[PDB]
């Protein structure tokens, strides 16, 4: 469907909050959904390449880790 | 009158709340549905280790939050308190994420 | 009798005279092209290397080199690069 | 024994030999496929051509036949992808693309 | 006949053996000296303690026995050097340092 | 039963009990410690290797791991890591 | 008595230097500064002429790029002059300081 | 013992000019010199370390390169 809109206005708020933002423009929610999209896009691609090269049909925690590490964005706690 | 807090007070309580906690701030399923969507653009009938979805949710939120942080500083830099697209935009331009 | 430092400068010059037969190149600019080669050499050899490691493989094949290129290179450059790649390998296994 | 270079079986300038040797000597793996140094020397060639194409064109406009660094710079920053590729790459004697933010211009 | 584990010969808890293997099978080099793994398991142990120190504290401060990621996050982010070292590292269930920018706070 | 995944978690426990004998560690965090080790393994091994190659050595010595650590780790952290590393090497050599 | 208004020679100087590629720092001052800074880390050190210029390339590249990032931070705050606080913002966002 | 001051107001201006800056606070030149210091310091540290590990009393262009690369500040045309 169109699941990007499942990233609720309240959700993006909660995230701005943990980031230490007091006040939020209306325009932000769609810019945010905007950027999140490009993040998950660039990351999932490189993940699935790692899935594909491994000749699997199931994306493993490592695929995403290998991906995040690649993209500049290393993650601790899912292995590797 | 019925009792009421003043614009920006609840926000600040909400900052303290969410900077104290670690729990993920996006709804699990909606995010999952988003992931499997953006996966169909690269291969169909894929599957995902429960753990691979979370590893992304932790990767996404962590990311956004740090953007908001760099954003909120570009708002404050323009004598504001309100984050606006042009603030994010400046972050990403300087971060070297767009041109 | 000095060192014996290998460059790529003579493969740049060939390719250069395949694509702009009339034009030349300053040493400074050959320097730059040389670096360029080494830099993308390492990036692909590297990303191939991991590919291998992550799947428990002792061998870097063309297949690794491909996936590496796919990961490292942008949309269009990657498509074309995969093809000159896949083109060149076939032309090789045929030739002899 | 017949003389023929591998490069000249793949129909490449970029030395399939040197590459394969550089791969084994570089400590990338225990084992190297015969197809890799081809596929890699292929890809190295192709990017060398894309850059040298665009740059050759930049050296005309400057009225020049020899490429200088600046042409490469002009070539690369002006191409969206090459720029994406050489984001975190300084090019000595490159200089910057001409660019002046609107607001800093007079009415 | 009696085989003392190298880790013991260095007084390291980190396995100097498994480090030596991982290196040779890593494709880092053709030949690994025999001090190298020692030196590395050493440095590894050390930074492992350096974090487990400051975290181990962060846990007490919260009146918690078992260390959770967030203690690690508190530990790493507050110590200046560890934070520089894990500049580009994201820590699962780690949250952020409590920090509110001055101009946002109310006017008393 | 099942295949055998190695870790570092037992060596983290031992070091935790040496450092805070009255303290546990959640799975999720023990993960994060594992990741950490692994990350700083690959980083020191990597730069070690680059150092060897750059200088035409086929052998990664303690001397490389040391210089790796001096380049990767910041001032104070480096000093100590250099110290805890040298100490361990000396005490291993002298044991035989 | 030909005089131009605060900012018109600037706009020219921008166009002159954006077009060229020569190094803008005088080279000796620069060379010395390096050795000054090398002392800190080891005494009686010697430098390949090319190593120096490689550092001058990197530095002049670094700064010019900062200035492009600084300059936007300025404009972001509806200004046209760059001020320490502009740089400070840039580097903080770039990840050069906390 | 203060060459930093050799990096002349009019030079820092030339860099800012190529960087598209039109107007420059006085407070700038120092802050700049400041940043340059950290940047040179940072790089040469890692440089000389390359020099020291190769038991050489001469720092080489390649030392400077391996360093710039480490710092992710990768440079072309000095032996990359
Ligand atoms: Cl092959
Ligand atoms: Cl050794």
Q: How far apart are CA H54 and CA F36, in angstroms?
A: 30
Q: How far is CA H17 from CA B84, D93, E65, G41, H8, in A?
A: 30, 16, 58, 33, 14
Q: Which residues contact D50 (CB under 8 A, 6 or more apart)?
A: C77, C80, D79, D82
Residues in chain H: 80
Q: Is G5 on the interface with H (CB under 8 A)?
A: no
What distance in Å separates the CA atoms of residue B41 and residue G69, rounded to the nearest whole number?
Answer: 34
Instruction: Say whether E96 and B65 touch across the interface (CB within 8 A).
Output: yes
Place of tokens 């008393």: E108
| Residue linked to tokens 């044991």 | F95
Overall size of chain F counted in residues = 96
Q: Which residues contact E108 (CB under 8 A, 6 or more apart)?
A: none
State which residue of chain F sits closest to D22, comparing Cα positions: F53
Nearest CA to G54 among D49, H32, H71, C6?
H71
Structure tokens at A51: 């899935």
**Token couple for B24:** 């993920």
H4 DSSP 8-state letter: G
Work out the burial of residue F17: count CB atoms within 10 Å of its CB; fewer than 13 is exposed, 13-18 middle, 19 or more buried: middle
Distance CA F90, CA F94 (A): 6
Name residues whose C-beta falls within 8 Å of residue A1's C-beta, 6 or more positions apart in sequence: B33, B37
Between the alpha carbon of residue H9 and those of residues A38, H19, H21, the distances in Å are 42, 15, 14
Q: If you ran DSSP here, which 8-state letter would residue A4 be given?
A: G
Tokens of G7: 């900012």
Q: Can you say whether the dihedral through the CA atoms of B79, B83, B86, B90 is positive or negative?
A: positive
Closest CA to B80 of B68, B88, B72: B72
Number of domains into which chain E is organized: 1
Domain span at residue E42? Answer: 1-108
Q: Which residues pair with D31 in a beta bridge?
A: C59
Are H49 and F71 in contact by the 8 Å Cβ rule? The answer is: yes
> How far is the CA of A25 from the CAs of A7, B82, C53, H54, in angstroms?
16, 6, 47, 56
Q: Are G10 and G36 in contact (CB under 8 A)?
A: no
Distance CA H80, CA H77 (A): 6
Among the bound ligands, name the one nearest to the CA of residue C66.
1
SS3 E28: coil
Report the DSSP pairing between strands A74-76 and E89-91. parallel
Answer yes or no: are the C-beta atoms of E72 and E51 closer than 8 Å. yes
CA F76, F80, F83, F89 dihedral sign is negative
Which of C89, C92, C95, C91 is closest to C69 using CA atoms?
A: C89
CB atoms within 10 A of CB A3: 16
Angstrom CA distances, C67 to C43, C73, E108, G55, H19, stand at 12, 10, 60, 35, 38
Alpha carbons C68 and C82: distance in angstroms, whole number: 10
Which residues, 6+ apart, have CB-to-CB distance to E42 below 8 Å? E10, E12, E14, F81, F84, F85, F87, F88, F89
For chain A, first and last CA: distance in Å? 33
CA angle G46, G47, G48 (to 5 degrees): 135
Residue D28: name the closest of F67, C61, C33, A71 by CA: C61
Unique residue bearing structure tokens 């300081």: G97
- Tokens 């037969």, located at residue: C21
Q: CB of H29 within 8 A of CB of H16?
A: no
What is the crossing angle of helices G49-76 and H27-53, to 10°? 140
Angle of helix G84-94 relative to helix H27-53, nearest 10 degrees? 40
Tokens linked to F84: 């805890």
The candidate with the shortest Cα–Cα distance to D14, out of G93, C12, E78, E43, is C12
Going along A35-73, which residue ranges are E strands? 58-59
Whole-Å CA distances, A68 to B31, B32, C10, C28, F46: 17, 17, 38, 36, 19
Q: Hey, what are G59's tokens?
A: 């530095």
Token reading at F6: 């190695």
**Solving technique:** X-ray
In chain E, the residue whose alpha carbon lies closest to the alpha carbon of B59 is E90
Cα E74-E79-E82 angle, rounded to 5 deg: 95
- C-alpha angle E13-E19-E21 in degrees, rounded to nearest 5: 140
Residue F4 backbone phi and psi in degrees, to 5: -115, 100
Q: How far is CA C56 from CA C51, C60, D94, E26, in A?
A: 9, 11, 42, 11
Distance CA A7, CA A40 (A): 13
| H71 DSSP assignment | T
Residue C10: which of F90, H23, D7, F26 has the closest Cα?
D7
Closest partner residue to A73 among E90, E91, E104, by Cβ? E90
Reference E106, options C67, B15, F89; nearest CA is B15
Compute the Cα dihedral for A30, A34, A35, A37 and give only its sign: positive
Tokens of H7: 């990096």
- The pair of three-digit structure tokens given for residue G43, joined into one six-digit string: 């005494």
Task: Tell me the C-alpha distance between G54 and H74, whole Å.
Answer: 11
**Which residues, 6+ apart, have CB-to-CB distance to E63 below 8 Å?**
none
How far E102 CA sits from the closest chain F CA (Å)?
Answer: 30
CB atoms within 10 A of CB C6: 9
H-only helix segments in G1-98: 8-19, 27-39, 49-76, 84-94
> How far is Cα D20 from Cα D33, in angstroms, rounded to an integer?
9
Q: Which sign, positive or negative, has the C-alpha torsion F21, E19, A60, E91?
A: positive
Is-contact G59 G37, C-beta < 8 A?
no
In this structure, the strands spanning H23-24 and G81-82 are: parallel
A56, with CB counted inside 10 A (0-12, 13-18, 19+), is: middle
φ, ψ of residue G22 in degrees (nearest 5): -60, 150
HSE value, Cβ hemisphere, 13 Å, CA-based, for H20: 21
Nearest CA to E75 out of E99, E95, E52 is that of: E52
Is there a contact between C65 and D39 (Cβ–Cβ < 8 Å)?
yes
d(CA A73, CA F93): 40
Cα H51 to Cα F90, H55, H66, distances in angstroms:
25, 7, 10
What is the C-alpha separation between G11 and G7, in angstroms, rounded?
A: 6
Measured distance CA(D77)–CA(B63) in Å, rounded = 27
Contact between chains at B99 and D83 (C-beta distance less than 8 A): yes
How far is Cα B52 from Cα B57, in angstroms, rounded to an integer?
9
Residues belonging to chain C: 96
Pairing assessment for the beta strands A58-59 and H74-76 based on DSSP bridges:
unpaired
Q: How far is the CA of C63 from the centre of ligand 1 (A)?
A: 7
What is the CA angle F75-F43-D33, rounded to 5? 155
Nearest CB to G64; choose among H3, H18, H41: H18
Instruction: Look at residues B29, G73, B89, D84 and name the one whose alpha carbon lies nearest to residue A35.
Output: B89
Three-state SS annotation for E82-98: HHHHCCCEEECCCCCCC
Q: CA B77, CA G88: separation in Å to the nearest integer? A: 11
Resolution in angstroms comes to 2.9
Three-state DSSP class for H49? helix
- Quick check: C46 contacting H, CB < 8 Å? no
Whether chain H has a CB inside 8 Å of the CB on F63: the answer is yes
What is the distance between the alpha carbons of residues E59 and F25, in angstroms, rounded to a whole number?
A: 10
| Ligand nearest to the CA of residue E40, numbered in listed order | 2
Asked if chain H contacts chain F via 3 or more Cβ pairs within 8 Å, the reply is yes
Q: C-alpha angle A48/A49/A53, rounded to 5°? A: 115
The residues whose Cβ lies within 5 A of ligand 2, an ion, are E 33, 35-36; F 61-62
β-bridge partners, E91: A76
Compute, in degrees rounded to 10, the torsion defined by CA atoms E10, E13, E14, E20.
40
Spell out a b/e string for F57-94, using b for 16 or more CB atoms within 10 Å of the CB, else e.
beebbbbbbbbbbbbbbeeebbebbbebbebbbeebee
Of D86, D61, D81, D83, the closest CA to residue D71 belongs to: D61
Q: Which residue of F has its CA nearest to A80?
A: F35
Closest CA to A59 of G48, C38, B36: B36
Residue written as token pair 């492992």: E48
What DSSP character marks residue A5?
G
Is C60 within 8 Å of chain E by CB? no
- How far apart are the CA of G93 and the nearest CA of chain E, in angstroms? 13
The CA distance from A40 to G24, in Å, is 42
Give the pair of three-digit tokens for residue D64: 């020049």
């Amino acid at each position: 469907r169109d699941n990007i809109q499942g990233i609720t206005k309240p959700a993006i708020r909660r995230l701005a909050r943990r980031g230490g933002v007091k006040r939020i423009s209306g325009l932000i929610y769609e810019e945010t959904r905007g950027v999140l999209k490009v993040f998950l896009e660039n990351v999932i691609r490189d993940a699935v390449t790692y899935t594909e090269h491994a000749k699997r049909k199931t994306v493993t925690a490592m695929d995403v880790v290998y991906a995040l590490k690649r993209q500049g964005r290393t993650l601790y706690g899912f292995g590797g | 009158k019925p009792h009421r807090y003043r614009p920006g007070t609840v926000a600040l309580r909400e900052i303290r709340r969410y900077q104290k906690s670690t729990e993920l701030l996006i709804r699990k399923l909606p995010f999952q549905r988003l992931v499997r969507e953006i996966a169909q653009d690269f291969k169909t009938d894929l599957r995902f280790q429960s753990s691979a979805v979370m590893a992304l949710q932790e990767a996404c939120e962590a990311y956004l939050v740090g953007l908001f942080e760099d954003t909120n500083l570009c708002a404050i830099h323009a004598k504001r308190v309100t984050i606006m697209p042009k603030d994010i935009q400046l972050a990403r331009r300087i971060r070297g994420e767009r041109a | 009798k000095r060192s014996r430092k290998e460059s790529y400068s003579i493969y740049v010059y060939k390719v250069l005279k395949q694509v702009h037969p009339d034009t030349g190149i300053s040493s400074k600019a050959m320097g730059i092209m040389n670096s360029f080669v080494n830099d993308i050499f390492e990036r692909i050899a590297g990303e191939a290397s991991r590919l291998a490691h992550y799947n428990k493989r002792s061998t870097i094949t063309s297949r690794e080199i491909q996936t590496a290129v796919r990961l490292l290179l942008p949309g269009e450059l990657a498509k074309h690069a995969v093809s000159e790649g896949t083109k060149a390998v076939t032309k090789y296994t045929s030739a002899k | 024994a017949k003389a023929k270079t591998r490069s000249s079986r793949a129909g490449l300038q970029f030395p399939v030999g040197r590459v394969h040797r550089l791969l084994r000597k570089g400590n990338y793996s225990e084992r190297v496929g015969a197809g890799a140094p081809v596929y890699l020397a292929a890809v190295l060639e192709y990017l060398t051509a894309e850059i040298l194409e665009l740059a050759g064109n930049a050296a005309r406009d400057n009225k020049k036949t020899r490429i200088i660094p600046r042409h490469l710079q002009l070539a690369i920053r002006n191409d969206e992808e090459l720029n994406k590729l050489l984001g975190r790459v300084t090019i000595a004697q490159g200089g910057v693309l001409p660019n002046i933010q609107a607001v800093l211009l007079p009415k």
